[PDB]
Amino acid sequence: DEDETTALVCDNGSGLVKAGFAGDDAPRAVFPSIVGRPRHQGVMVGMGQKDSYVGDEAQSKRGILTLKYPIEHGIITNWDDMEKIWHHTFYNELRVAPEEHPTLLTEAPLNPKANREKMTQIMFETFNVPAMYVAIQAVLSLYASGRTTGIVLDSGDGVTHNVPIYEGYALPHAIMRLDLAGRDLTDYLMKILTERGYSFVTTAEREIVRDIKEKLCYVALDFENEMATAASSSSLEKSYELPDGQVITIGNERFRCPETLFQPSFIGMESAGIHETTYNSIMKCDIDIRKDLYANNVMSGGTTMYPGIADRMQKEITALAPSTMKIKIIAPPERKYSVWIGGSILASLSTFQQMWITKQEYDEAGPSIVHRKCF
Amino acid sequence: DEDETTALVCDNGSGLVKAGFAGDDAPRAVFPSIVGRPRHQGVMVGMGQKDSYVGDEAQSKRGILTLKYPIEHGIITNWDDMEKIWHHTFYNELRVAPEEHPTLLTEAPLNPKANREKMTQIMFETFNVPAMYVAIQAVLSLYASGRTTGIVLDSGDGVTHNVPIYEGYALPHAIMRLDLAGRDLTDYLMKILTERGYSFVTTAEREIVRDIKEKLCYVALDFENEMATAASSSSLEKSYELPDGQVITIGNERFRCPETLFQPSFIGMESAGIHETTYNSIMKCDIDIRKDLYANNVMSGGTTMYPGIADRMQKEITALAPSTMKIKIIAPPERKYSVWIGGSILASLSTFQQMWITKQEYDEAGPSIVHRKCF
Amino acid sequence: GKVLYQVEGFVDKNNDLLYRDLSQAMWKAGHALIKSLFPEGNPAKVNLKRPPTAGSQFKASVATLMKNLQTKN
Amino acid sequence: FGNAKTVRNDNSSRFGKYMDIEFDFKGDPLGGVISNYLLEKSRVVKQPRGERNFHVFYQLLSGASEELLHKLKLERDFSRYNYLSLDSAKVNGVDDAANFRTVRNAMQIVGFSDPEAESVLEVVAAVLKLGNIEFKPESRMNGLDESKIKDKNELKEICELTSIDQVVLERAFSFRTVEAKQEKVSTTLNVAQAYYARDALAKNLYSRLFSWLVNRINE
């Protein structure tokens, strides 16, 4: 089938499956991490109509399905559904046999270890890969940045990290994990669109709210004067055509969605915000690291494609950090993919080929071997 | 590699490696005597990142290292680490082969003799120098002064001597050795900056405290009225920008650091102070020497670059010594280097070339030969 | 025998990035020869798994020439 | 296209040339196929000192006419190129100008037409002509780590020579595009990767031109 030993870089952070080959620019198979299930009976005889719809095919039929993300906040909930996602990933979209290729998974730090361990157990026992590795999402986000020094903000669909790394060495004590991410912003956006007058309650309607969040939101550099501006005039009211008919027109909801990311008191989650978890992750580091963390602050995962979020980020960290510091919020426009791109780089290095957790070494010490080889 | 037989003058007193060639003005390789070691794991694959950082390269990465001076109070503690310091000294900074050059080491008087003996053993067995000598630090500090008569105060990072020498003859019974030096002043300065409010506990932070000691301290000619002056107004408060951010502002800590050197009861070490070890080293000498020790008191090592320390020194010895004596505290501003400079002079003399402890004479009587040829 | 190699410019001369915008751009150019040089510059043809380098090209070229060589006498 | 003066040779082969002499199975001659191998393309963008580029650049500059070098927009002084030095512009024993007419004549004998070989000279003039493009960091405005070209007059003559619009190629030196199943986006290159992008375009253009030359001779 395949005449190569190219490593597979499979990457489900929490909300969007992206996969491909090692040593490649763009991820080959990008599709949402959903499994579908018909919530009512079928009538037409002779249709096919299996009781599983995974990936973008589920979004073709999302009107008649109960959509269900199998992984939540980076934690895999239903292992059978995630096995459907992986089966559709390798066998249908990417269309390659896992038996002949090493695999490079990704996860979050501060993960429940049964996710990592059972993920390795499914990768070796079911799909029978020859090699396997459990990559950290944020470190790979620093691999695609072309740097070896920087603090990493990625903020995927269910997790954000702010992992500081200095000169090839990470700082595991200064690590962070906040559970405020894009799915919570989608639920809050659904709540405030219910406040305006557009009632979205279905999971398919929740997917439409995610579409409105992706297309039509920005970050509000100064939230107070932007709030008074939205209360002032209708220069911020924007119409978005929903699928099948009625258009919407959003005002202050256009920028109160990512302000929740910068201020978690709107969603009532006790936290300090993104800009203070960065500053706290810098202040937990030592004294002689911090200007290298200021000049190389990376903001290159998902949920950062809101326009001007680097201006709010630099404008706020400048207010937090002491003066005469050069706050460089590195936002390369290739983000939302840079964790896969760092997967492609790290899977294509020459030094990495003796760090593979491989079979006959998996079977030697069982599934706990990941906690002694990987990290 | 080198077309010369120029003798190497390598000089680690206790805290700063300075090395170079014989017959030269400035030492060629000056770098701190530290070895680094990463106190936590590495993450980035493909970095280099060896488990050794020596010299100023360690100060480039001191945020992620546990710094460790291999020599303490002039006594070498870890021979492997000092072998790393010498290997980096000859092979990387000075960049010359030790096989073709005689070497001129330095040490303290009243040394444990395994330091001298094992130092000669490492210089002949490992680096295979043709010749070797174990120079006294203070005598070389009198060679760079251009005199043959004087009492020598140098006060390096871990030791001070006050070696009296009259007309080419030293006085070995009147010799002194006090273990109060600049590293103890660095620890006391770290303690009183903790008293003010700036908490420094890391070895890298201890290096920052050493930087504040070098830049921003003076000697307080009269400590009582200077103490009442610092308690009076804020004309002595001085701000120093730390690396990466927060500035400091020191008051009475600016001059209570070297007063500990003149008064060891602040650090609780039972002694008489520098000014009374000088006077006791003069009073242990005979009667007809002392005005030549008064007119030629040398103060030319490290930890004497505090402004006005010659005024406190002369002003105190004048109070101790009897009247009608001319107390000339010779402080040539080329100090902190004068022990190397005396190494360059003494290694470039014509008479010295039959005082080299050489190979085939080392092998004749073993490593004890230093205790019969050198001193 | 022993041959000395100066390390200056190795990483400079391994760089062989010929990424997709140059190939699609020179495929877009009106000269028919430059279209005839870059057949992968068509965006209808998916580019591929497509990285650099130079030493990989010379390694695969010495291995390929060695293969076609040793298949003969 | 494949020789250069080196430190120790006046003339040296810097590739391997293979020749198929193909016979019928009963023993009658059929034909043959030239195959090139291992073109030292790193010489094209930088030479060690005391050495020379490939001979076709020196023969092209020294041996062409006024109308041809006006069509190729080529200065004929060797000081006005970053890929050529003035020191090895001339040795004795090899005369580049007559050898250029020897190469164009021999190219006509091996069977190319006039605008075909003239188009080959257009591409060689593009490879040499790419050398005078230099970069600088974008800092007005500064966002974020963007590379900038220095001048446009060289670039517009390259784009006019290759019949391409300028803004596409000016995009193509500074940005690289990451695609997807549904989208593509342009991220920035820095200063150094712009230099290696230009040099890689030069030596890959020359090498693939040389392979197309061997391919077209194979007919």
Ligand SMILES: Nc1ncnc2c1ncn2[C@@H]1O[C@H](COP(=O)(O)OP(=O)(O)O)[C@@H](O)[C@H]1O
């Ligand atoms: N252009 C965009 N604007 C705003 N939000 C976006 C955009 N693109 C993606 N997102 C959000 O980012 C999340 C996916 O981020 P990503 O890091 O790809 O997830 P994963 O953790 O699966 O890798 C989705 O919830 C989506 O809503």
Ligand SMILES: Nc1ncnc2c1ncn2[C@@H]1O[C@H](COP(=O)(O)OP(=O)(O)O)[C@@H](O)[C@H]1O
């Ligand atoms: N300008 C300065 N002001 C105050 N202290 C200094 C200055 N320069 C060096 N020192 C102190 O002197 C010590 C080094 O003294 P030195 O005699 O060079 O040591 P060594 O014994 O290695 O020769 C260091 O610990 C440093 O703190």
Ligand SMILES: [Mg+2]
């Ligand atoms: Mg992600």
Ligand SMILES: [Mg+2]
């Ligand atoms: Mg000293």
